[PDB]
Short mmCIF file of C-alpha atoms and ligand atoms in Angstrom, two decimals:
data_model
loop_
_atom_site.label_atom_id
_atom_site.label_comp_id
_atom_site.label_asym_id
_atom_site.label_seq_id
_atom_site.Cartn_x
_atom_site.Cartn_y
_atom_site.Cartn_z
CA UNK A 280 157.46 107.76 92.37
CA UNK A 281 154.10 109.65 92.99
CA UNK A 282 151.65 106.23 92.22
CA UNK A 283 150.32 104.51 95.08
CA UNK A 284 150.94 100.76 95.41
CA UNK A 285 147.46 100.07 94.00
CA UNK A 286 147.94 102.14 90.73
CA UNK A 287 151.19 100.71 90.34
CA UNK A 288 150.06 97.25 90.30
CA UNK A 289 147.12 98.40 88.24
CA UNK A 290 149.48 100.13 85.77
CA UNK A 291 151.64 96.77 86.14
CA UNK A 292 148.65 94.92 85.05
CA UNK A 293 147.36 96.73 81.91
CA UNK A 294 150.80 96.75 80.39
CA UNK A 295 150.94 92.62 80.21
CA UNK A 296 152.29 91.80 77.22
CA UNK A 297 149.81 89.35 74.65
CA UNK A 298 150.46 85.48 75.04
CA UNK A 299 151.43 84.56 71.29
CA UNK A 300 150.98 81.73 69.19
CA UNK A 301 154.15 79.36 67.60
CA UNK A 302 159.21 68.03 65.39
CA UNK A 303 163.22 67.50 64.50
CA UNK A 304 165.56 69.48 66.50
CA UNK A 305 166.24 71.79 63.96
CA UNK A 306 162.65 72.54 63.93
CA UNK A 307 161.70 72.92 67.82
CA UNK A 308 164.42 75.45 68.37
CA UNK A 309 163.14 77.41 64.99
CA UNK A 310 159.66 77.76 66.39
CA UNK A 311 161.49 78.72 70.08
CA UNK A 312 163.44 81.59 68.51
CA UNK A 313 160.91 82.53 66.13
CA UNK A 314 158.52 82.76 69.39
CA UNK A 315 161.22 84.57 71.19
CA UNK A 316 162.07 87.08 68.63
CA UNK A 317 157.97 87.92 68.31
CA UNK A 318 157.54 88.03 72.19
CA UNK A 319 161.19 90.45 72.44
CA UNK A 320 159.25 92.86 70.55
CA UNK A 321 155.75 92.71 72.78
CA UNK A 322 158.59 93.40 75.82
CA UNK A 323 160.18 96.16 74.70
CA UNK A 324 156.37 97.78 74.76
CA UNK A 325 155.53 96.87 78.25
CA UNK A 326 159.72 98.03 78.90
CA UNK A 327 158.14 101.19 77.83
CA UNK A 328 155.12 100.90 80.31
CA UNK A 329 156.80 100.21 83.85
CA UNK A 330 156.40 103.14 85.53
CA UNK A 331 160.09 104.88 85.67
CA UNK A 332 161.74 102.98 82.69
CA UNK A 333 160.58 106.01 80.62
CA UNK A 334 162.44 108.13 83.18
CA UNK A 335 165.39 106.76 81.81
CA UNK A 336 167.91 107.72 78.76
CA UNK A 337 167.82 106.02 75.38
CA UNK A 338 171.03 103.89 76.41
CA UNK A 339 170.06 103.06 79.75
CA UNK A 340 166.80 101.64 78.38
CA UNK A 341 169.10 99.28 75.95
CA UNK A 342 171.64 98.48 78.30
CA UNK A 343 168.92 96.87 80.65
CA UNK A 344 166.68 95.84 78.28
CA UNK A 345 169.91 94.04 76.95
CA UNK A 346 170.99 92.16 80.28
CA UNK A 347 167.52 91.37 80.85
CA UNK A 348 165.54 90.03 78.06
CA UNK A 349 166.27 86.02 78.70
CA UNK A 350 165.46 86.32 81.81
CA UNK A 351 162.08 88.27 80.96
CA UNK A 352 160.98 85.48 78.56
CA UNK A 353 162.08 83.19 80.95
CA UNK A 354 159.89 84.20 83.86
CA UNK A 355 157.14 84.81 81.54
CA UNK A 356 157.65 81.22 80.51
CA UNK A 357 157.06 79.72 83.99
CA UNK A 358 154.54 82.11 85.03
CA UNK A 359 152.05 80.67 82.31
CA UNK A 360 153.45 77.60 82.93
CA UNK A 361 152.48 77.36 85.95
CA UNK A 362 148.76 75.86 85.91
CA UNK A 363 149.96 73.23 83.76
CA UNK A 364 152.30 70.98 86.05
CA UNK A 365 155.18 69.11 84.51
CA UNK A 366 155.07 70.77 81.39
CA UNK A 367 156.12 74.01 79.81
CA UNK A 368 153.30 76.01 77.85
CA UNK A 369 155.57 78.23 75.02
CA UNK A 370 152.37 78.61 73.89
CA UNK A 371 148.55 77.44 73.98
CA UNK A 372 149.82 75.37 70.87
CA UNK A 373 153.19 74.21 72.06
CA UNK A 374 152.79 72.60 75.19
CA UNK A 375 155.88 70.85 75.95
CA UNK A 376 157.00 68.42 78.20
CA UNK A 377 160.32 67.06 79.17
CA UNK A 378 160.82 64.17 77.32
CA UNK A 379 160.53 66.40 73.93
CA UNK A 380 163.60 68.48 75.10
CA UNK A 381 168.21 72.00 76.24
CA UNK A 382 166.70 69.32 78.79
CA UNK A 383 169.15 71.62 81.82
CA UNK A 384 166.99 74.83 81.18
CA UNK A 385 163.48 72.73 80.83
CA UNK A 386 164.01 70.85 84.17
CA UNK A 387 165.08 74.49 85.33
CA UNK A 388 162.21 76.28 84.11
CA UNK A 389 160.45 73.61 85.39
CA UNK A 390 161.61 73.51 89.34
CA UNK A 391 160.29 77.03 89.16
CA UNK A 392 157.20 76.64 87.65
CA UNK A 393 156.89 74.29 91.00
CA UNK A 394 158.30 76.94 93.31
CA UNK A 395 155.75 79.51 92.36
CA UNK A 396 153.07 77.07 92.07
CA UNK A 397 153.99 76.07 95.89
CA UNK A 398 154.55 79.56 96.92
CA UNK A 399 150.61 80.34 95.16
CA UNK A 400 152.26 83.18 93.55
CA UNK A 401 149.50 85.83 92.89
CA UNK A 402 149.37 88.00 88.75
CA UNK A 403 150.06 91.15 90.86
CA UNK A 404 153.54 89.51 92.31
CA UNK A 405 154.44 88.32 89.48
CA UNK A 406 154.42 91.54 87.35
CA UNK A 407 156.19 93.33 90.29
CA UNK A 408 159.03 90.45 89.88
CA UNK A 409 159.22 91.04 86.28
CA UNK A 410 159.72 94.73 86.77
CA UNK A 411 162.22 93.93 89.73
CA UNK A 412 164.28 91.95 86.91
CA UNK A 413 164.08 94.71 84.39
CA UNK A 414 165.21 97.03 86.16
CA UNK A 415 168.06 95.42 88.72
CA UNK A 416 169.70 92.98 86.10
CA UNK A 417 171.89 95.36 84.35
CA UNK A 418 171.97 98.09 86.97
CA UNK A 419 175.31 97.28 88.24
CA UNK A 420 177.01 97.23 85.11
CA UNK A 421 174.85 108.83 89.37
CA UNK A 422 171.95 109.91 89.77
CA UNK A 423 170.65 107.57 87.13
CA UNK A 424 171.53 104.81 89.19
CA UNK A 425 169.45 106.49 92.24
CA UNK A 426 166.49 106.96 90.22
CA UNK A 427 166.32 102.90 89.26
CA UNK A 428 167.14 102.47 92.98
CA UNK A 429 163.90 104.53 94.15
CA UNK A 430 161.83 102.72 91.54
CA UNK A 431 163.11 99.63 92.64
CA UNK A 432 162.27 100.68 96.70
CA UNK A 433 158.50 101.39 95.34
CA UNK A 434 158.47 98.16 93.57
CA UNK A 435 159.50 96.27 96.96
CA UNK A 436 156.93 98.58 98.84
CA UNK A 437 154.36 97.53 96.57
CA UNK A 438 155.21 93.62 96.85
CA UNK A 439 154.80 94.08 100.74
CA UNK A 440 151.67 96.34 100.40
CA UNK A 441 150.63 93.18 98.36
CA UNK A 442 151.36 90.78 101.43
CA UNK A 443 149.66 92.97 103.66
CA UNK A 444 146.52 93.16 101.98
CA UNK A 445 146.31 89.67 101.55
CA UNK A 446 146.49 89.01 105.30
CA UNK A 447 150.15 88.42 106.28
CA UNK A 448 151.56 89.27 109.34
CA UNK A 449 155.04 91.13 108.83
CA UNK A 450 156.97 87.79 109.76
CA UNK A 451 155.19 86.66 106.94
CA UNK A 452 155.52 89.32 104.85
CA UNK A 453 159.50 89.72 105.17
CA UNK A 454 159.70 85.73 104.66
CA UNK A 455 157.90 85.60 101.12
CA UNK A 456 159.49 88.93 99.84
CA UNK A 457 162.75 87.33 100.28
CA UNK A 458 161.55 83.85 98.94
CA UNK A 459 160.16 85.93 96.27
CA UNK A 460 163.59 87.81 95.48
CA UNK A 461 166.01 84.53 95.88
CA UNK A 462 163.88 83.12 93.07
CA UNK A 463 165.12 85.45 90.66
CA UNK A 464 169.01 84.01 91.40
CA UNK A 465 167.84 81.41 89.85
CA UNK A 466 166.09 82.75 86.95
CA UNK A 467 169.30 84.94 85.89
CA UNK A 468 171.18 81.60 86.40
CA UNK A 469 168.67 80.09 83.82
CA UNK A 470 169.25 83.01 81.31
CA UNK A 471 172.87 82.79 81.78
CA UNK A 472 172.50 78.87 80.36
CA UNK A 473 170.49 80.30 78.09
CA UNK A 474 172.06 82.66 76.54
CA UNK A 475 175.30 80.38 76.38
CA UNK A 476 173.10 77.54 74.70
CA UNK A 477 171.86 80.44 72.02
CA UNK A 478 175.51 81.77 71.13
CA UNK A 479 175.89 77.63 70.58
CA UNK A 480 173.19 77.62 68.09
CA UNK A 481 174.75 81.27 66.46
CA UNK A 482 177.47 79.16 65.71
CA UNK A 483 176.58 76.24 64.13
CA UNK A 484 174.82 78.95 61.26
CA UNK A 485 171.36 76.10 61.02
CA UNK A 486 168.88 77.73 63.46
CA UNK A 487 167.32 80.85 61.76
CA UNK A 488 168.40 83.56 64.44
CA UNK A 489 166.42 86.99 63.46
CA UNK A 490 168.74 90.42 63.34
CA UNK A 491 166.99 91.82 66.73
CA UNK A 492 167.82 88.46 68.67
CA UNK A 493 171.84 88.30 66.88
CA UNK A 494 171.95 92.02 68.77
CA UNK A 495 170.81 90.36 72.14
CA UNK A 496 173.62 87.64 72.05
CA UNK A 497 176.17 90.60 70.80
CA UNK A 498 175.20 92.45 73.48
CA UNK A 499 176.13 89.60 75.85
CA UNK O 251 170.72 99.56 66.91
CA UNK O 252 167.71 97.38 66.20
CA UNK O 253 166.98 97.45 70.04
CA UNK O 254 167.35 101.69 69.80
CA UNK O 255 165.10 102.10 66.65
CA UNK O 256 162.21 99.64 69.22
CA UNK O 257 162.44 102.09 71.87
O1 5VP R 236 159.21 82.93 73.76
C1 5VP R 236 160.11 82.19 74.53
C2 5VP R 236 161.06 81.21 73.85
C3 5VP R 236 161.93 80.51 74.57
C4 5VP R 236 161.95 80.70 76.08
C5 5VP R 236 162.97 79.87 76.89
N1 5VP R 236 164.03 79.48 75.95
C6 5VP R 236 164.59 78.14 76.08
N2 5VP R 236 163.87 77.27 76.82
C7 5VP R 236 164.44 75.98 76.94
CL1 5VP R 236 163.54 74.78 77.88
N3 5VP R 236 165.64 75.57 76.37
C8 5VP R 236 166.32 76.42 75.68
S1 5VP R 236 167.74 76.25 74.91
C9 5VP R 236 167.62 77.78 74.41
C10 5VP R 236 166.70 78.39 74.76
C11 5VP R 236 166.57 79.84 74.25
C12 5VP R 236 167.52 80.98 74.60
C13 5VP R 236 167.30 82.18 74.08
C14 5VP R 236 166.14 82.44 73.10
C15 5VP R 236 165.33 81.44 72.78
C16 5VP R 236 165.57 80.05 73.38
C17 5VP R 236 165.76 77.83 75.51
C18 5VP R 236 161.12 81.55 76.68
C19 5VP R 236 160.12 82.35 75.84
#
């Protein structure tokens, strides 16, 4: 609670995870898990790196690291996404588009990728979101609870310090904070298909579903 | 679990 807005987004920046490298149906969903399962592990360093989440006991770490993951990856997803209109970019080498899709989440995904490419969402707002998601997802399921809540104040102050830099009058500023914050309704409703759609492929026993991603669908 | 021994 002692950074200023600049060092936080600073801090923010130079934990970014690494964009990673990856057709039957059987076969997309194997490189999509197998991606997924690689990029988990990249999170749970930059988890590690959002200023607070250290703060934090062992099993408050897992417990929001557990509600949040999907939704992580799934923000992560459009944010790279974004530059590349229609399509979703897994990775430089799986570019996807909808046709190849599962086809619920893409057009999802998608209609975000759109919102934040209409919106002009800015690398500094976008790693605030992702820290907003980490650490608000699972926070309603004492003074544990106040700490996240501070973080999360000096997250929102630093979004707004953001606006203001960049010009915005505070009419402005209070209208794309909460644009900014209704998005993430509908990422958690993504991850919540998500998630459903991976306890589907858990039980049909053909998708190769790594230990460390069978934990994440236990865990919901 | 696996999630713990990450941390
Ligand atoms: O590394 C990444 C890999 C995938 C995503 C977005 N994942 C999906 N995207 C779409 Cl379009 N459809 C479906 S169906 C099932 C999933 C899914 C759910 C849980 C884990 C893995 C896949 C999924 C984001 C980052």
């Amino acid at each position: 609670l002692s950074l200023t807005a600049d060092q936080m987004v600073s801090a923010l920046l130079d934990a970014e995870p690494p964009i990673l490298y990856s057709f039957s149906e059987a076969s997309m969903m194997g490189l999509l898990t197998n991606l997924a399962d690689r990029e988990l592990v990249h999170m749970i360093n930059w988890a590690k790196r959002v200023p607070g989440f250290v703060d934090l006991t062992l099993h408050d770490q897992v417990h929001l690291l557990e509600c949040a993951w999907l939704e992580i990856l799934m923000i992560g997803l459009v944010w790279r996404s974004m530059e590349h209109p229609g399509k979703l970019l897994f990775a430089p080498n799986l570019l996807l588009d909808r046709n190849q899709g599962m086809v619920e989440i893409f057009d999802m995904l998608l209609a975000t990728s759109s919102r934040f490419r209409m919106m002009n969402l800015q690398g500094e707002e976008f790693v605030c979101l992702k820290s907003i998601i980490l650490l608000n997802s699972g926070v309603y399921t004492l003074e544990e609870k106040d700490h996240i809540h501070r973080v999360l104040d000096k997250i929102t102050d630093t979004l707004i310090h953001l606006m203001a830099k960049a010009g915005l009058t505070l009419q402005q500023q209070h209208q794309r904070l909460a644009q900014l914050l209704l998005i993430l309704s509908h990422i958690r409703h993504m991850s919540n298909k998500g998630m459903e759609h991976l306890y589907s492929m858990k039980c049909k026993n053909v998708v190769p579903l790594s230990d460390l991603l069978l934990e994440m669908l236990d865990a919901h | 679990k696996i999630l713990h021994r990450l941390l």
